[PDB]
Ligand binder design. Structure first.
Ligand SMILES: CCCCCCCCCCCCCCCCCC(=O)OC[C@H](COP(=O)([O-])OCC(O)COP(=O)([O-])OC[C@@H](COC(=O)CCCCCCCCCCCCCCCCC)OC(=O)CCCCCCCCCCCCCCCCC)OC(=O)CCCCCCCCCCCCCCCCC
Ligand SMILES: CCCCCCCCCCCCCCCCCC(=O)OC[C@H](COP(=O)([O-])OCC(O)COP(=O)([O-])OC[C@@H](COC(=O)CCCCCCCCCCCCCCCCC)OC(=O)CCCCCCCCCCCCCCCCC)OC(=O)CCCCCCCCCCCCCCCCC
Ligand SMILES: CCCCCCCCCCCCCCCCCC(=O)OC[C@H](COP(=O)([O-])OCC(O)COP(=O)([O-])OC[C@@H](COC(=O)CCCCCCCCCCCCCCCCC)OC(=O)CCCCCCCCCCCCCCCCC)OC(=O)CCCCCCCCCCCCCCCCC
Ligand SMILES: CCCCCCCCCCCCCCCCCC(=O)OC[C@H](COP(=O)([O-])OCC(O)COP(=O)([O-])OC[C@@H](COC(=O)CCCCCCCCCCCCCCCCC)OC(=O)CCCCCCCCCCCCCCCCC)OC(=O)CCCCCCCCCCCCCCCCC
Ligand SMILES: CCCCCCCCCCCCCCCCCC(=O)OC[C@H](COP(=O)([O-])OCC(O)COP(=O)([O-])OC[C@@H](COC(=O)CCCCCCCCCCCCCCCCC)OC(=O)CCCCCCCCCCCCCCCCC)OC(=O)CCCCCCCCCCCCCCCCC
Ligand SMILES: C[C@@H]1CC[C@@]2(OC1)O[C@H]1C[C@H]3[C@@H]4CC=C5C[C@@H](OCCC(CO[C@H]6O[C@H](CO)[C@@H](O[C@H]7O[C@H](CO)[C@@H](O)[C@H](O)[C@H]7O)[C@H](O)[C@H]6O)CO[C@H]6O[C@H](CO)[C@@H](O[C@H]7O[C@H](CO)[C@@H](O)[C@H](O)[C@H]7O)[C@H](O)[C@H]6O)CC[C@]5(C)[C@H]4CC[C@]3(C)[C@H]1[C@@H]2C
Ligand SMILES: CCCCCCCCCCCCCCCCCC(=O)OC[C@H](COP(=O)(O)OCCN)OC(=O)CCCCCCCCCCCCCCCCC
Lengths: 383, 135, 103, 62, 53, 57, 139, 80
């Protein structure tokens, strides 16, 4: 979304109340995170707590491993509720953006003020706390969805093009899953058909081998600030933490069937945090429930059985596929009756163009026959 | 907010200078947008007429520049050094004398390394002025 | 759909290209530019006379001397410099007057 | 890449296309400048500069 | 008027996908074609037998 | 202005061909899933037999 | 028929290229120069072979115009710029650039004098800049 | 044929001998520009861009331009 004066006025008016609300949310989220971190350190697996090292097979660069460095706390409901987890995730996003802005301010002293003016003129990178009314919140969500639309197609295309150019699926079912994975949101994708793509891509690329450019695109699509990007293991850590929280909440909801009892707005927010339901689509409860059930089905039974989610790259692609809108086409079909090269009509045809028209025109067969006969006669005379 | 980062933010109307632009595009497209105009890395086209037209024009303007701006400096230096060492001394001559001197300079250029050396080496016994004539 | 090359304006695309596509190359280029302007940005008068002129240095008018003369005149006039000061001459003003009367 | 285009079969056809007309004009200039130089620089009345030994590029670059 | 192709090409190039050949995807999709009536009959018979069993 | 446009133009044909093949594949899959379901209904002979039994014949 | 161009080929022969399958083949066995179907495609043999397609007047059974609902997609975004609009923008920009470059070329190769001339009749001899001003303490 | 390095392109035949032999040639339908068409000289009957302007005339024009360029100073010399 482009900046505007109205949004600038809105954010300037709500600047200090927004900061106060952000501080209160910071205290609450620190409490929640303290509970969660204590639980992880106490009951977490040895590899997860000790931060086991997983190195790439080519350049031996460490990155988070989905199996070892990610853990689903099945018993987190006792200490932390689902709403607290959602609050923590939202605060994590807001705190990331605020921390980047504060770092810029500290780095550049008082010279960041005009850049702050640019910042407050757009809702893309402002915290949710800056909105004090429903309309402002709707505009902020619209800006976030616009950024997601802007960013996701690049990530999807990167993944698909790299895999298709450097590899092909093994079997027909994998082919169908791969082809149907990257369909536009206007059609409904069957998670059962699409799941094998997760194993196929695990064979190709895991989350531990994700490239830095693809990571940048993904972080853009998740509304995670990317500047300064730095090494790939910082935003990678952010992504891992966010999706670990999301998986814990998803396990809680699946086990307790909370989504059925969840209200309409809370359900919409829950889907949105999973990048499943844009607000500009004006989805109803039926569609939200369908998408959430499809997401749970894609996670698969193994997620509940052992807390193991499918490949995170493929999961991110699948969820972001809902922001891959069909390519725009505007204009009545009658426009196809016009011509594009009328301005050249005055130039006419030169000798070469006339020759080409004569040779390759409707008389082409006659010209070919005459030319071949003449050439054969000349060759015979030569011999 | 001040300036847009998107090229979509137009500054003019779609019909601004449509006609002249169409004429310019007609000039560009007629010979270049053809199947046989396959370029080699965008630098060497496939149309023969492009070469036939562009090589002479390039040579002509380069030669005009070289003759009227670059070699002129050498010619003027020769005239000044050989006929007083000052611009006024050269201007004291007539146009015909300057023409003669400049044509001799052209002769020297044409001879280069493949010609007689008496044009710059004074044979012993020559009566013509030496290097210390003006000193 | 959004693409950097097609949607962004030229300056924005330039910054993106040289920050997230070829940043190391840009850094090396800036380093080399700084080196060139720090160590290869000077030319002595003798060097200019030898190689600095297309057809050769025209000693019959010595434009370098005129250039330096204009430079020094401008500096003296603007900065209000007393070129008769003993440090410039190495002798007192009275000695300078005595020398002027002598010669 | 030299793929195609109008190609006159002989000299008389160079007037069948404006581009080749300009090309032949340029070729005429190119080839006719040489006889002009022959006539101008081998003229009977052409005289070497008397002061040619006063100065030369050879002493300057040396 | 063929927006899908445009978007795919532009995105592939903007993500450093300069190459214009995809032998693997073509190999996966080259032999695709609409079936003949007899092939449809055979496929329907297979499906009916599967449903029966 | 020059390079990316040229490579996009080079990409266009292959992508068009692949998308046409993909659409044909979708249509083929749609056709292949169609089967005529022949339903079976209770034979009326048994109904006639039960009617006779009810008559005590 | 008109003199207009067609789908660009790059001076390539589609019967031997690495993506030849993407180009339909006609009855005569000549692959098209474009994804479209061409009946009168030909091949010319210079130093290298290249494919050509000659536009011609041909009638094709035109399916009736559909409804706007089934082919229009109103997913346009503020950043989106259509290919036609981009072409217009670039045409105007290149026209102005061409005029500027023409003026520059004329000035450079016919009017701009070369610096540091021996006679001093043309071009500057150079001068100093950034000289101090109003700083008597500097000396 | 060739003119220096520029070679005249040649259209590859597309018809087989059997089909070709069955083709009936009717030059009456051909344009006047291309009648008695010869692959070795297809532009023999092609019209001139300017009526009465021969190739030799342009060659001589260029030669005259060169002569002017070399001789003008001889007749109208100018001082330095
Ligand atoms: C005055 C001197 C200034 C020096 C120059 C500074 C120049 C600017 C550089 C930037 C400095 C920091 C700017 C503020 C950031 C805000 C604080 C913060 O870390 O936020 C958390 C957040 C952590 O991010 P993450 O990815 O979630 O972390 C993953 C971890 O696993 C997270 O671990 P976890 O998963 O276990 O979760 C823990 C989480 C759990 O907690 C929570 O969830 C609750 C929330 C806690 C965080 C709240 C942050 C709030 C931010 C907004 C504040 C308000 C802004 C208001 C603005 C308007 C004001 C009018 O709590 C944390 O976030 C703790 C993080 C660790 C602490 C980091 C701070 C260390 C420095 C401070 C101590 C210095 C001592 C000096 C002693 C001197 C001795 C001689 O910070 C960021 O977003 C990262 C910074 C982004 C910008 C990066 C810019 C480049 C930096 C390069 C630095 C290189 C070294 C310095 C030299 C530079 C030369 C070029
Ligand atoms: C009070 C407030 C509260 C307190 C403060 C709170 C903290 C605030 C601070 C933190 C805020 C963070 C968030 C900021 C968000 C907004 C950022 C932004 O700018 O967005 C673009 C923003 C518009 O954003 P938007 O419309 O909302 O669209 C956002 C979209 O989402 C589009 O989004 P996008 O992602 O596509 O855009 C991103 C784009 C952002 O960039 C841009 O969009 C470009 C912006 C500038 C474009 C300028 C175009 C016009 C140029 C005009 C030229 C002059 C014309 C003639 C003037 C004549 C005057 C007489 O690209 C980048 O991100 C590139 C990043 C490049 C990083 C560079 C790093 C360099 C590092 C160096 C290497 C080091 C290596 C290591 C070495 C180690 C050695 C030991 O741009 C503008 O508003 C344009 C302003 C132009 C101003 C006028 C021209 C410049 C005037 C200069 C005056 C100089 C005066 C002094 C002269 C002295 C001479 C002696
Ligand atoms: C046709 C001609 C047109 C004109 C052309 C003009 C001529 C240009 C020629 C050269 C152009 C190429 C130059 C390339 C250089 C090499 C770059 C390189 O190696 O980068 C590697 C690498 C590449 O960056 P990356 O993070 O991988 O991704 C870059 C993408 O662009 C990230 O993209 P993304 O899509 O992933 O993320 C988008 C979005 C994502 O959103 C976010 O991230 C959220 C918002 C973040 C806000 C910023 C947070 C910063 C946190 C602290 C950073 C560390 C600070 C270190 C300490 C301070 C050091 C000064 O981020 C933004 O929107 C960024 C907004 C930044 C706006 C400012 C852009 C520059 C405009 C000019 C302003 C300054 C003018 C000074 C000169 C004039 C003075 C009178 O750079 C870094 O790691 C970044 C380090 C940044 C350090 C701070 C800046 C140091 C440079 C000196 C600053 C001096 C300030 C002076 C203030 C005023 C004094 C009077
Ligand atoms: C205006 C400000 C100007 C600032 C200038 C200063 C420089 C810039 C400042 C910082 C800028 C912000 C961004 C920095 C890069 C961020 C990288 C990143 O994303 O890291 C994430 C990463 C977090 O990810 P993680 O998953 O937690 O851990 C990484 C994984 O282990 C990763 O796992 P892995 O699988 O990748 O494991 C490998 C990993 C393992 O390494 C690590 O990641 C561990 C942390 C680094 C350890 C480094 C120390 C190693 C031991 C040194 C022993 C030296 C003994 C010498 C004894 C001498 C006795 C005479 O990497 C290595 O193996 C690399 C080792 C380092 C090799 C160094 C080779 C240097 C060659 C020198 C050639 C010759 C030079 C010239 C000649 C000199 C002599 C005449 O961060 C770190 O681990 C540490 C980050 C530290 C950032 C730098 C802090 C800067 C503090 C500056 C203070 C001084 C300021 C002075 C100002 C002056 C006035 C202006
Ligand atoms: C308001 C502006 C900002 C004010 C300051 C803000 C606060 C500080 C900022 C950061 C300061 C960094 C300090 C040094 C860090 C370490 C590096 C180092 O060793 O530096 C050595 C030295 C600095 O000296 P120092 O170490 O501070 O101590 C003094 C020593 O005593 C001297 O000892 P030395 O032996 O080294 O001395 C030799 C000489 C050494 O000086 C040099 O070697 C100069 C090197 C210049 C590097 C420029 C980097 C950027 C290049 C961009 C790409 C250009 C591509 C090519 C384009 C060609 C056609 C234009 O030093 C000097 O005299 C330094 C003068 C530097 C003047 C900088 C002027 C930049 C003009 C850029 C024009 C761009 C035109 C684009 C037009 C496009 C239109 C479409 O040079 C530099 O640092 C050069 C980079 C300076 C960057 C400044 C910040 C960005 C630019 C702001 C001004 C933009 C003006 C635009 C005008 C447009 C007109 C059309
Ligand atoms: C990235 C972008 C690209 C585009 C661009 O921007 C950057 O690129 C930039 C690069 C620019 C060019 C850079 C360089 C020149 C040469 C200059 O030529 C000065 C000639 C004059 C110099 O005279 C001195 O003037 C000083 C004034 O203070 C005085 O002090 C000082 O005493 C005096 O000598 C006149 O010369 C007289 O010539 C006469 C004989 O003929 C005689 O009289 C005599 O010989 C001599 O005086 C004429 C302008 C031009 C073409 C610039 C145009 C604009 C640009 C294209 C910019 C453009 C905007
Ligand atoms: C932010 C200012 C705050 C203070 C108020 C200053 C008001 C000064 C009076 C201005 C009167 C003329 C205004 C004309 C309309 C300007 C519209 C504009 O700013 O558009 C920017 C335009 C480039 O637009 P583009 O990036 O393509 O997209 C824009 C949509 N986002 O850019 C252009 O095409 C250039 C247009 C330049 C118009 C003049 C701007 C002068 C600004 C001076 C500010 C300094 C204070 C002046 C105080 C004056 C007091 C009398």
């Amino acid at each position: 979304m482009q900046g505007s004066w109205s949004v600038l006025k809105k954010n300037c008016s709500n600047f200090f109340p927004g900061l106060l609300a952000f501080a209160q949310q910071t205290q609450e989220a620190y409490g929640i995170w303290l509970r969660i971190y204590n639980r992880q350190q106490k009951y977490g697996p040895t590899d997860f707590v000790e931060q086991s090292e997983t190195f790439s097979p080519d350049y031996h660069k460490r990155f988070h491993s989905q199996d070892k460095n990610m853990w689903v706390d099945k018993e987190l409901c006792t200490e932390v509720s689902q709403k607290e987890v959602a609050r923590l995730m939202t605060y994590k996003l807001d705190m990331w953006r605020m921390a980047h802005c504060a770092g810029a301010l500290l780095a550049t002293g008082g010279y960041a003020i005009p850049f702050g003016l640019f910042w407050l003129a757009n809702d893309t990178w402002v915290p949710s706390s800056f909105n004090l009314t429903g309309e402002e919140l709707r505009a902020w969500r619209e800006a976030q969805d616009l950024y997601r639309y802007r960013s996701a197609p690049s990530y999807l295309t990167d993944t698909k093009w790299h895999f298709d150019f450097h590899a092909y699926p093994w079997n027909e079912t994998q082919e169908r899953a791969w082809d149907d994975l990257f369909e536009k949101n206007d059609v409904r994708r069957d998670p059962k058909v699409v799941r094998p793509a997760a194993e196929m891509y695990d064979g190709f690329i895991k989350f531990e081998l994700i490239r830095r450019k693809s990571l940048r695109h993904l972080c853009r699509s998740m509304n995670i600030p990317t500047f300064p990007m730095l090494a790939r293991l910082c935003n990678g850590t952010r992504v891992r933490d966010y999706w670990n929280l999301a998986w814990c909440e998803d396990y809680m909801v699946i086990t307790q069937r909370l989504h059925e009892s969840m209200t309409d707005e809370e359900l919409y927010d829950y889907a949105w945090r999973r990048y499943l339901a844009p607000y500009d689509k004006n989805l109803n409860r039926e569609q939200l429930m369908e998408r959430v059930e499809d997401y749970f089905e894609f996670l698969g039974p193994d997620f509940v059985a052992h807390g193991k989610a499918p490949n995170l790259v493929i999961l991110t692609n699948y969820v972001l596929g809902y922001y891959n809108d069909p390519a725009y086409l505007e204009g009545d079909i009658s426009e196809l009756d016009k011509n594009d090269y009328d301005h050249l009509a005055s130039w006419g045809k030169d000798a070469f163009l006339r020759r080409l028209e004569f040779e390759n025109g409707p008389l082409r067969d006659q010209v070919e026959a005459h030319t071949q006969r003449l050439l054969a006669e000349r060759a015979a005379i030569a011999k | 907010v001040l300036f847009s980062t998107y090229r979509s933010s137009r500054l003019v109307s779609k019909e601004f200078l449509h006609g002249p632009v169409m004429r310019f595009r007609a000039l560009g497209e007629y010979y270049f947008q053809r199947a046989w105009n396959g370029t080699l890395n965008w630098a060497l086209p496939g149309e023969y007429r492009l070469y036939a037209v562009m090589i002479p024009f390039i040579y002509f303007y380069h030669r005009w520049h070289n003759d009227h701006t670059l070699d002129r400096d050498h010619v003027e230096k020769a005239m000044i050094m050989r006929w007083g060492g000052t611009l006024e001394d050269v201007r004291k001559l007539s146009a015909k004398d300057q023409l003669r001197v400049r044509c001799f300079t052209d002769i020297e250029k044409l001879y280069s390394a493949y010609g007689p050396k008496d044009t710059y080496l004074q044979p012993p016994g020559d009566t013509l002025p030496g290097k210390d004539f003006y000193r | 759909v959004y693409t950097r090359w097609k949607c962004d304006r030229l300056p924005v695309f330039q910054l993106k290209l040289f920050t997230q596509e070829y940043p190391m190359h840009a850094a090396v280029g800036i380093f080399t530019i700084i080196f060139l302007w720090k160590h290869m940005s000077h030319c002595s008068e003798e060097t200019e006379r030898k190689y600095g002129w297309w057809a050769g240095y025209p000693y019959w008018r010595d434009p370098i001397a005129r250039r330096n003369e204009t430079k020094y005149k401008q500096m003296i006039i603007n900065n209000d410099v007393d070129i008769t000061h003993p440090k410039w001459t190495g002798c007192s003003v009275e000695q300078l007057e005595e020398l002027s009367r002598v010669v | 890449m030299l793929l195609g285009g109008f190609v006159p079969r002989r000299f008389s056809q160079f007037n069948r296309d404006p581009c080749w007309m300009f090309f032949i004009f340029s070729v005429g200039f190119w080839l006719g400048e040489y006889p002009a130089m022959m006539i101008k620089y081998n003229a009977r009345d052409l005289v070497y500069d008397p002061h040619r030994y006063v100065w030369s590029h050879h002493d300057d670059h040396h | 008027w063929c927006p899908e192709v445009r978007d795919r090409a532009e995105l592939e190039v903007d993500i450093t996908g300069w190459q214009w050949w995809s032998p693997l995807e073509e190999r996966r999709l080259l032999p695709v074609r609409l079936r003949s009536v007899n092939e449809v009959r055979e496929i329907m018979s297979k499906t009916q037998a599967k449903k029966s069993a | 202005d020059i390079m990316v446009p040229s490579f996009v133009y080079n990409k266009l044909p292959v992508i068009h061909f692949l998308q046409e093949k993909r659409a044909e594949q979708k249509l083929r899959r749609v056709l292949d899933e169609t089967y005529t379901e022949w339903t079976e209904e209770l034979d009326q002979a048994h109904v006639t037999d039960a009617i006779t039994r009810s008559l005590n014949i | 028929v008109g003199n207009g161009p067609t789908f660009s080929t790059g001076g390539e022969c589609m019967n031997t290229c690495d993506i030849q399958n993407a180009f339909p083949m006609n009855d005569r066995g000549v692959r098209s120069s474009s994804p479209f179907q061409e009946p009168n495609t030909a091949i010319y043999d210079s130093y290298l072979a290249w494919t050509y397609f000659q536009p011609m007047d041909v009638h094709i059974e035109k399916l009736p115009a559909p409804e706007a609902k089934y082919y229009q997609r109103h997913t346009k975004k503020p950043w989106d710029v259509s290919s036609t609009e981009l072409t217009e923008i670039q045409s105007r920009k290149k026209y102005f650039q061409t005029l500027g470059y023409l003026v520059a070329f004329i000035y450079l190769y016919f009017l701009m004098p070369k610096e540091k001339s021996f006679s001093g009749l043309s071009g500057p001899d150079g001068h100093w800049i950034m000289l101090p001003k109003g700083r008597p303490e500097l000396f | 044929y060739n003119m220096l390095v520029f070679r005249d392109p040649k259209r590859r035949p597309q018809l087989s001998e059997e089909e070709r032999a069955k083709v009936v040639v009717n030059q009456a339908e051909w344009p006047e520009e291309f009648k008695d068409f010869d692959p070795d000289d297809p532009y023999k009957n092609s019209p001139e861009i300017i009526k009465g302007m021969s190739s030799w005339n342009l060659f001589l024009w260029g030669v005259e331009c060169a002569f002017i360029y070399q001789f003008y100073e001889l007749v109208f010399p100018k001082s330095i």
